[PDB]
Design a protein around this ligand. Structure first.
Ligand SMILES: *[C@@H]1O[C@H](CO)[C@@H](O[C@@H]2O[C@H](CO)[C@@H](O)[C@H](O)[C@H]2NC(C)=O)[C@H](O)[C@H]1NC(C)=O
Ligand SMILES: *[C@@H]1O[C@H](CO)[C@@H](O[C@@H]2O[C@H](CO)[C@@H](O)[C@H](O)[C@H]2NC(C)=O)[C@H](O)[C@H]1NC(C)=O
Ligand SMILES: *[C@@H]1O[C@H](CO)[C@@H](O[C@@H]2O[C@H](CO)[C@@H](O)[C@H](O)[C@H]2NC(C)=O)[C@H](O)[C@H]1NC(C)=O
Ligand SMILES: *[C@@H]1O[C@H](CO)[C@@H](O)[C@H](O)[C@H]1NC(C)=O
Ligand SMILES: *[C@@H]1O[C@H](CO)[C@@H](O)[C@H](O)[C@H]1NC(C)=O
Ligand SMILES: *[C@@H]1O[C@H](CO)[C@@H](O)[C@H](O)[C@H]1NC(C)=O
Ligand SMILES: *[C@@H]1O[C@H](CO)[C@@H](O)[C@H](O)[C@H]1NC(C)=O
Ligand SMILES: *[C@@H]1O[C@H](CO)[C@@H](O)[C@H](O)[C@H]1NC(C)=O
Ligand SMILES: *[C@@H]1O[C@H](CO)[C@@H](O)[C@H](O)[C@H]1NC(C)=O
Lengths: 98, 49, 49, 116, 146, 49, 98
């Protein structure tokens, strides 16, 4: 601190990193995997999830016929992610150790 | 009298400092377009809030 | 332009060739430790022992 | 080198006098060290034989079955025209082996040719 | 001390170079000797193939990839309702130019007539949200008719 | 000696952090920008997104 | 230089590296991905590129019906690689750093 030791700020601010993550999230939500290979091609999100179900070897009608249940499961899982991360801090130990 | 030891030290530390920003850029700057979500958050029941 | 019943389908394509450069090997260096420290001096080598 | 009448020594490395002006006769002579380099012993397993070859690394075959390779002077190994897989790596595409019974040095082969 | 410092830096730099060389070998295996589905591992876009070129102390990969170029807007539906059956595309996506419905492959616009060989049937028309009414043609009907 | 020890430790830690950052960039490319078939690379189970 | 420091030549010469790269290129051009997994199986190059189009989810008729355009695009892209390499002096920064 006082002995010739200086800490240099990162080139990208936390706001800029948040902007990058938000852009990635928006691209994935609105266009699936197309924006990573080229121009972003819009597609309805249930249709994108049907594409991904096909990707894991499950037919699209399984998603379409269970759309509400699958959406509820996803929403509950994200809410539980929030709950669990806010419940215990040791999950972020890998960062804290740094 | 010791020569250029700490010039080496500063060079190494500067390399590390540059590598940190390179790491962040490689992780997060994987798209040149800044995409935005539509104002109407209607995604067929899926909720990303 | 996201909506719940709209899609974008490409009507054409581009064949793209891009370059990726990767280091593989460094220059193979050898150092004669005694010669570097105590060049052709026998008192210095005896002390270095 | 052109040492101006005030210049006595010479230093292109800045820590070793690579040239010097003789005081008796003002001729200026450069000082290059005598020679040096690694010495490598190429051997098969002593469980096979006691014969060895010697590689004097990065030196011409005058400062020291004498084969001048890009890695230096090889003594005790016969050079052969044939190409094989590398057995003992010597360097710069040259490898050594022990075959019936002498130590041979050869250009390594990258593989069998194959036209599809 | 100077020699020890040099050797330590050389060891660390050699470790970094070994990591780079391992990555280069992996890319040689998966991009040059095969076609990789890993996004961005070979190049930007859908990887087609890769060509290696030697360089002093390293390698240069020329990655040949496929990039969609000229996109167009269409209206979509998840399924088509014909006779109380829900039809889903076997491969591709249902697409509409405003008046008529087709089925296309997903990465290149190639409109085709929606047929029973083009789609598969699953359930009735009351479950899928956003199902669109349209006709599905059977190529066997003209053949058995004529 | 203390400064040299600190700098060498920083270099090793930076190498570890660089490995972590490269893995994170690979996961950003293959799990976020695409759907991966690599088992356990993008979570436990069959990767959706 | 003269203080006990020497440089050891690489085992493989640059010509041998060029030979390895040329062998890899010939194998890829004449047999696609088959020589990597076993014996080299010859296949005409447009048919191999049709295989790769199938691999990226595009039907083969797209390639066959656009063969001349695709070949022209590939040739011009390789030529642009050539032009850029001999126009950007900082292109080979990763190697020069080493
Ligand atoms: C998405 O989920 C969030 C909760 O994670 C919903 O936010 C709640 O909305 C209700 C109704 O407006 C409020 O009473 C709650 O206080 C909100 N909770 C939080 C934590 O913000 C949100 O409404 C959902 N989105 C949609 C479109 O249903
Ligand atoms: C949507 O596509 C259909 C079929 O390709 C179009 O209908 C055709 O239009 C052409 C006019 O160029 C006629 O010659 C054909 O006889 C039509 N086919 C049928 C089966 O009717 C339709 O015009 C397109 N709609 C729009 C808005 O472009
Ligand atoms: C698709 O076509 C069917 C007819 O095959 C439509 O069914 C009608 O649905 C309405 C309600 O929207 C009922 O009042 C009628 O009695 C139904 N008639 C028949 C014959 O089934 C259906 O509505 C159409 N779907 C859309 C979205 O227009
Ligand atoms: C696709 O783009 C090429 C230029 O790369 C052009 O020559 C061709 O006409 C285009 N095809 C269509 C169907 O627009
Ligand atoms: C020193 O004496 C020698 C011997 O006579 C002579 O050759 C030399 O020229 C002298 N030096 C000078 C600078 O005259
Ligand atoms: C060794 O010396 C000979 C002397 O004529 C020369 O021709 C040859 O090029 C030298 N080789 C090397 C490697 O310097
Ligand atoms: C290799 O063969 C040539 C003749 O083709 C001969 O002149 C040469 O001496 C041979 N090399 C050795 C090492 O015997
Ligand atoms: C699709 O429509 C939107 C308007 O909602 C427009 O901004 C966009 O450019 C269109 N896409 C194409 C490929 O024309
Ligand atoms: C799509 O959104 C519109 C409102 O903009 C709504 O009328 C329609 O029912 C929705 N369709 C689906 C399949 O979500």
């Amino acid at each position: 601190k006082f002995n010739g030791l200086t800490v240099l700020p990162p080139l990208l601010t936390d706001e800029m990193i948040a902007q990058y993550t938000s852009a990635l999230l928006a691209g994935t939500i609105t266009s699936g995997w197309t924006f990573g290979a080229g121009p972003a091609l819009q597609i309805p999100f249930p249709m994108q999830m049907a594409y991904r179900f096909n990707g894991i070897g499950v037919t699209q009608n399984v998603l379409y016929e269970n759309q509400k249940l699958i959406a509820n499961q996803f929403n509950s899982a994200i809410g539980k992610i929030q709950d669990s991360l806010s419940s215990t801090p040791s999950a972020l130990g890998k960062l804290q150790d740094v | 009298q010791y020569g250029s030891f700490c010039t080496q030290l500063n060079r190494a530390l500067t390399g590390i400092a540059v590598e940190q920003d390179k790491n962040t850029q490689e992780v997060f700057a994987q798209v040149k377009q800044i995409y935005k979500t539509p104002p109407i958050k209607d995604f067929g029941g899926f909720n990303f809030s | 332009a996201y909506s719940n019943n709209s899609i974008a389908i490409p009507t054409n394509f581009t064949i793209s060739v891009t370059t990726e450069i990767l280091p593989v090997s460094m220059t193979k260096t050898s150092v004669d430790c005694t010669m570097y420290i105590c060049g052709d001096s026998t008192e210095c080598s005896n002390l270095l022992l | 080198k052109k040492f101006l009448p005030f210049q006595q020594f010479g230093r292109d490395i800045a820590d070793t006098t690579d040239a010097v002006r003789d005081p008796q006769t003002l001729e200026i002579l450069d000082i290059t060290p005598c020679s040096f380099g690694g010495v490598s012993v190429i051997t098969p397993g002593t469980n096979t034989s006691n014969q060895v070859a010697v590689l004097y690394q990065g030196v011409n075959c005058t400062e020291v079955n004498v084969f001048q390779t890009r890695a230096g002077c090889l003594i005790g190994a016969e050079h052969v025209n044939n190409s094989y897989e590398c057995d003992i790596p010597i360097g710069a595409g040259i490898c050594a082996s022990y075959q019936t019974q002498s130590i041979i040095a050869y250009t390594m082969s990258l593989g069998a040719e194959n036209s599809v | 001390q100077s020699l020890q410092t040099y050797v330590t830096q050389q060891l660390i730099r050699a470790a970094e170079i070994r990591a780079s060389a391992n990555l280069a070998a992996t890319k040689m295996s998966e991009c040059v000797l095969g076609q990789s589905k890993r996004v961005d591992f070979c190049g930007k876009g859908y990887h087609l193939m890769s060509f290696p070129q030697s360089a002093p102390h390293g390698v240069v990969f020329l990655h040949v990839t496929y990039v969609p170029a000229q996109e167009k807007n269409f209206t979509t539906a998840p399924a088509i309702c014909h006779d109380g059956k829900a039809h889903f595309p076997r491969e591709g996506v249902f697409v509409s130019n405003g008046t008529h419905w087709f089925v296309t492959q997903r990465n290149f616009y190639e409109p085709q007539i929606i047929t029973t060989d083009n789609t598969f049937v699953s359930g009735n028309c009351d479950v899928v949200i956003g199902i669109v009414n349209n006709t599905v043609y059977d190529p066997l009907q003209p053949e058995l008719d004529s």
